Design a protein around this ligand. Structure first.
Ligand SMILES: [Mg+2]
Ligand SMILES: [Mg+2]
Ligand SMILES: [Mg+2]
Ligand SMILES: [Mg+2]
Ligand SMILES: [Mg+2]
Ligand SMILES: [Mg+2]
Ligand SMILES: [Mg+2]
Ligand SMILES: [Mg+2]
Ligand SMILES: [Mg+2]
Ligand SMILES: [Mg+2]
Ligand SMILES: [Mg+2]
Ligand SMILES: [Mg+2]
Ligand SMILES: [Mg+2]
Ligand SMILES: [Mg+2]
Ligand SMILES: [Mg+2]
Ligand SMILES: [Mg+2]
Ligand SMILES: [Mg+2]
Ligand SMILES: [Mg+2]
Ligand SMILES: [Mg+2]
Ligand SMILES: [Mg+2]
Ligand SMILES: [Mg+2]
Ligand SMILES: [Mg+2]
Ligand SMILES: [Mg+2]
Ligand SMILES: [Mg+2]
Ligand SMILES: [Mg+2]
Ligand SMILES: [Mg+2]
Ligand SMILES: [Mg+2]
Ligand SMILES: [Mg+2]
Ligand SMILES: [Mg+2]
Ligand SMILES: [Mg+2]
Ligand SMILES: [Mg+2]
Ligand SMILES: [Mg+2]
Ligand SMILES: [Mg+2]
Ligand SMILES: [Mg+2]
Ligand SMILES: [Mg+2]
Ligand SMILES: [Mg+2]
Ligand SMILES: [Mg+2]
Ligand SMILES: [Mg+2]
Ligand SMILES: [Mg+2]
Ligand SMILES: [Mg+2]
Ligand SMILES: [Mg+2]
Ligand SMILES: [Mg+2]
Ligand SMILES: [Mg+2]
Ligand SMILES: [Mg+2]
Ligand SMILES: [Mg+2]
Ligand SMILES: [Mg+2]
Ligand SMILES: [Mg+2]
Ligand SMILES: [Mg+2]
Ligand SMILES: [Mg+2]
Ligand SMILES: [Mg+2]
Ligand SMILES: [Mg+2]
Ligand SMILES: [Mg+2]
Ligand SMILES: [Mg+2]
Ligand SMILES: [Mg+2]
Ligand SMILES: [Mg+2]
Ligand SMILES: [Mg+2]
Ligand SMILES: [Mg+2]
Ligand SMILES: [Mg+2]
Ligand SMILES: [Mg+2]
Ligand SMILES: [Mg+2]
Ligand SMILES: [Mg+2]
Ligand SMILES: [Mg+2]
Ligand SMILES: [Mg+2]
Ligand SMILES: [Mg+2]
Ligand SMILES: [Mg+2]
Ligand SMILES: [Mg+2]
Ligand SMILES: [Mg+2]
Ligand SMILES: [Mg+2]
Ligand SMILES: [Mg+2]
Ligand SMILES: [Mg+2]
Ligand SMILES: [Mg+2]
Ligand SMILES: [Mg+2]
Ligand SMILES: [Mg+2]
Ligand SMILES: [Mg+2]
Ligand SMILES: [Mg+2]
Ligand SMILES: [Mg+2]
Ligand SMILES: [Mg+2]
Ligand SMILES: [Mg+2]
Ligand SMILES: [Mg+2]
Ligand SMILES: [Mg+2]
Lengths: 86, 107, 80, 122
RNA sequence: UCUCAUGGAGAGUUCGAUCCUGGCUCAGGAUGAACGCUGGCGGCAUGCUUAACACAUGCAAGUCGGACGGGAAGUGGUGUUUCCAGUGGCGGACGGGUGAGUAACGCGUAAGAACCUGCCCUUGGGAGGGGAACAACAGCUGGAAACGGCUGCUAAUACCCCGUAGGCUGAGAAGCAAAAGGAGGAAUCCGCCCGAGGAGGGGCUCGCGUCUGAUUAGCUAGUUGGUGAGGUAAUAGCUUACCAAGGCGAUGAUCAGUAGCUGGUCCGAGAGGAUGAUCAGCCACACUGGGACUGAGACACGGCCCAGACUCCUACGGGAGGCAGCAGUGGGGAAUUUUCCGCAAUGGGCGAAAGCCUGACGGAGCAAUGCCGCGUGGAGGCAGAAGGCCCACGGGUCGUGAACUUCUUUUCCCGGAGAAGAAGCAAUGACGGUAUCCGGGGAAUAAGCAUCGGCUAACUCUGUGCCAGCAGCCGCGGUAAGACAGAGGAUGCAAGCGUUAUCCGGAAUGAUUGGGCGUAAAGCGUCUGUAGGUGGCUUUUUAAGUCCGCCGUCAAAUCCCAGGGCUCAACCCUGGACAG
């Protein structure tokens, strides 16, 4: 399906990262949307990603008792690069 | 005399006899593998030239492979378990020879 | 294996079968892969949807005697 | 009131509390009378009411009302009790089914007989 | 005045009256219901919710002589044919029961990638040459039995060896691995070994959804990750050593408490609440705990081993066992059935087939447990008589009601015939001589139960006197009781009618739709401020929400719509779809 985009809370460990993914859900009864946040152990060979990074999160085989997810380069995001002003 | 429990009894006895066959076929493997590991330790530690010492080692290796597969097709083992036993032996045989000096792939 | 057989529906004394493609180890009325034929003795009602039948006979589904001979009457064994 | 506050689970129901805890989810229970005696009703209803104490199978002891006119019940009798409240007598939450087990039917009652456990007269 | 709507009811009770806030109570549905009274029939369903408490008896998994050596029944004999323990072959992992444990990827849904796979299809190649045993049997022997022990003996599709192999190990060099015959007079069939596919059945991983408790606040050290070696059918702290210090947590971790989950069911105008019997899927368990073995598949209900608890047999030395399989017994309990018939149908197992076995299933029996249908008569019947009850004694009312006269016979009774369900060779039916059909009698064989003060439809009189009693709530009852008990009369339902228990409703009474906080319950004593929520205007971008189209799926059964079949209905069957 669609992969999950998030930001990194912890880089400290080797070949891994700890991502936080925020999603909104329409709470079952009261029809307002809510932010629920979940954390993941993402496998990141090469340790390219630092803390604060905004990374896309992908699915693969189990690497550990926790990490199922491949850390993957940010998928599509709006350029924080300045644009013309006509 | 007339005996009726086919299912239970007959299957129980069969289970014994087959069990002993299986035990044999496995013991074989743990054994010949073990001799291989003794030969590999003895070679890893000392200095002989492999070209020479690999002959007894490969007689033992060929034996253990024979035991392995005989026990696959006799069917005490699952083939995919076999593959790992063999790959283990191959790996050790490859480990000692890098210590000594003949072969090292790098790219 | 996959079997094409009858599952018994309807009521006490009045019995009506569906012809179904289902794994041989599920119960007689248990869950199935596909519903195919319809059968019934008393109304003498019988008919089958043949594309499914053939697609299962092709993948190796084995019928049961009654069914076997139903497919016979409807000439599905000739096309095969 | 505030949405954000309801989403913290601010609406919780009051559960349904039974009027006859001693029955434990049953239509009737059987018990043995420990005592059979009279009590006076809360004023201004003056009379003498026929109540027994019954020790039940579910282990409880309760005080059950006995209906109709007159009765044969005495201690170590095995009766059958059912639910329902006598608004007069404080604490009395249970009746005693007449015509079953050790309670006989009311004698000579001609009307609404099923409520008292009496045969039809021929 | 097109389109949508097929839906939302109130009443009593605080006061001398009123208006309000607020509780209690009632009218309605539904049961796996129980109890009381009463009970004619048929149709389809249902039937230990409690003790996952104990179990006497009998039956619930076998089959293959066309793998094989034997011996035992006959026959005249190896021409015929049967049975039978034993080795081997597949099956006993399905089917059947239960809901104890489980707050978990267990379940529902939607994804993934590192796997396995007997039987069934599809396909590529093969099946040389030897040998060794072990039951059975024989002899000796130990045991009450259960079951054993020695020495001999033998066949095989059972074991072992060698040769060859589009496979496996490996960078390679190389190394390593298979077979089984039985039928038939032959053709040929069923098998056997190695690969490579298919479908189905399993194993794992992850998003989402998946009870109450803060008077439970910190929990975790193979714990969270990294490498090296091992292990698994496969990925993985699955294991182990070393290195690092992480992981989870006030959005509720951990701990305690309850609970199998889901299609669904019941209720609701809807939004949603409560629940998870029968029926169908998945999980878990098999006397209480733990192991593995065999095997494609089990950590195996009617298998093994051990420990424990309990029952039985014993000639005292030892053995045997596991109904939460179908019936059945005790026990607990308000409460839940026959130690039934049959493999004829469907489904399974084995077999070349003939066939054998199936307490799955198909049926019967018992029970108003529930839902649906029908009956207990139809038409006429002076307006005269007996009797009950009321009456200002005039009369009223039970009452066209009965009696009475005719018609009809579903049901009842006595005789006859008598199915489909059976499938393409005939044969083969447990149900059953049942369902249905034809004749003969004859109103003939069949109405109870609640209520009658308000809510709530239906009223008077005799008997009682704060007594006996009633009651869902208000409250009735101290001499004329429309509220007690009886009578007559009426009203409601009807083979059922009531009472109790349970759940939703009404309840806008936990409120999103849908309430409140000056005085009725309710604004922290007041600020500052962290997380969190919401946040002015204009242009652009993006497209997460949002919207529209198309596809996949959300099993079948159920609910909804449209037809069809049992004489109708309930019930069954076909087709299709909104929601979400
Ligand atoms: Mg062999
Ligand atoms: Mg026919
Ligand atoms: Mg209520
Ligand atoms: Mg007041
Ligand atoms: Mg008043
Ligand atoms: Mg109110
Ligand atoms: Mg009611
Ligand atoms: Mg009776
Ligand atoms: Mg039970
Ligand atoms: Mg027994
Ligand atoms: Mg039998
Ligand atoms: Mg024969
Ligand atoms: Mg035979
Ligand atoms: Mg054979
Ligand atoms: Mg012969
Ligand atoms: Mg035999
Ligand atoms: Mg089983
Ligand atoms: Mg089962
Ligand atoms: Mg059943
Ligand atoms: Mg899941
Ligand atoms: Mg699972
Ligand atoms: Mg979850
Ligand atoms: Mg096998
Ligand atoms: Mg050969
Ligand atoms: Mg060889
Ligand atoms: Mg022959
Ligand atoms: Mg021959
Ligand atoms: Mg639930
Ligand atoms: Mg360690
Ligand atoms: Mg439980
Ligand atoms: Mg409502
Ligand atoms: Mg049950
Ligand atoms: Mg079931
Ligand atoms: Mg038990
Ligand atoms: Mg094995
Ligand atoms: Mg298990
Ligand atoms: Mg078993
Ligand atoms: Mg058993
Ligand atoms: Mg039983
Ligand atoms: Mg009993
Ligand atoms: Mg009892
Ligand atoms: Mg029988
Ligand atoms: Mg059969
Ligand atoms: Mg059959
Ligand atoms: Mg077969
Ligand atoms: Mg049955
Ligand atoms: Mg009867
Ligand atoms: Mg009935
Ligand atoms: Mg009946
Ligand atoms: Mg009854
Ligand atoms: Mg009952
Ligand atoms: Mg008449
Ligand atoms: Mg007639
Ligand atoms: Mg025929
Ligand atoms: Mg007739
Ligand atoms: Mg009225
Ligand atoms: Mg009354
Ligand atoms: Mg009530
Ligand atoms: Mg007076
Ligand atoms: Mg007087
Ligand atoms: Mg009076
Ligand atoms: Mg008078
Ligand atoms: Mg009265
Ligand atoms: Mg009367
Ligand atoms: Mg409500
Ligand atoms: Mg509101
Ligand atoms: Mg209010
Ligand atoms: Mg005040
Ligand atoms: Mg106040
Ligand atoms: Mg203030
Ligand atoms: Mg304060
Ligand atoms: Mg502030
Ligand atoms: Mg802020
Ligand atoms: Mg903002
Ligand atoms: Mg704005
Ligand atoms: Mg469906
Ligand atoms: Mg219709
Ligand atoms: Mg019709
Ligand atoms: Mg349908
Ligand atoms: Mg949809």
């Amino acid at each position: 399906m669609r992969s999950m985009q998030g930001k990194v809370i912890c880089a400290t460990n080797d070949k891994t990262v700890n991502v936080e993914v925020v999603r909104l859900a329409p709470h079952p009864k009261y029809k307002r949307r809510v932010r629920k946040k979940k954390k993941y152990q993402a496998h990141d060979p090469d340790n390219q990603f630092k803390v604060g990074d905004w990374v896309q999160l992908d699915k693969c085989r189990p690497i550990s008792k926790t990490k199922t997810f491949l850390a993957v380069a940010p998928e599509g995001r709006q350029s924080s690069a300045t644009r013309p002003k006509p | 005399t007339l005996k009726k429990a086919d299912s239970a009894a007959k299957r129980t006895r069969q289970a014994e006899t087959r069990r002993l066959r299986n035990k044999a076929r496995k013991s074989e493997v743990k054994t010949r593998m073990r001799k291989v590991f003794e030969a590999l330790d003895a070679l890893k530690k000392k200095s002989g030239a492999s070209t020479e010492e690999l002959v007894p080692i490969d007689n033992l290796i060929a034996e253990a492979y024979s035991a392995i597969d005989k026990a696959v097709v006799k069917g005490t083992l699952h083939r995919n378990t076999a593959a790992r036993r063999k790959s283990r032996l191959a790996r050790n045989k490859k480990v000692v020879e890098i210590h000594h000096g003949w072969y090292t792939p790098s790219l | 294996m996959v079997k094409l057989r009858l599952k018994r529906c309807g009521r006490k004394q009045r019995a009506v079968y569906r012809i179904v493609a289902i794994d041989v180890r599920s119960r007689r009325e248990g869950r199935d892969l596909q519903k195919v034929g319809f059968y019934d003795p008393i109304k003498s009602q019988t008919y089958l949807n043949v594309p499914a039948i053939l697609d299962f006979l092709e993948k190796g589904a084995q019928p049961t005697e009654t069914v076997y001979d139903i497919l016979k009457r409807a000439e599905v064994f000739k096309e095969f | 009131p505030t949405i954000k506050q309801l989403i913290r689970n601010t609406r919780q129901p009051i559960r349904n509390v039974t009027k006859s805890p001693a029955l434990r989810g049953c239509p009737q229970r059987r018990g043995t009378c420990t005592r059979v005696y009279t009590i006076t009703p809360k004023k201004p209803n003056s009379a003498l009411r026929k109540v027994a104490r019954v020790r039940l199978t579910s282990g409880f002891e309760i005080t059950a009302y006995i209906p109709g006119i007159g009765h044969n019940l005495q201690e170590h009798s095995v009766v059958l009790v059912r639910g329902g409240r006598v608004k007069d007598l404080p604490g009395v939450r249970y009746h005693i089914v007449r015509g079953t087990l050790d309670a006989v039917g009311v004698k000579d009652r001609q009307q609404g007989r099923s409520k008292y456990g009496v045969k039809k007269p021929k």
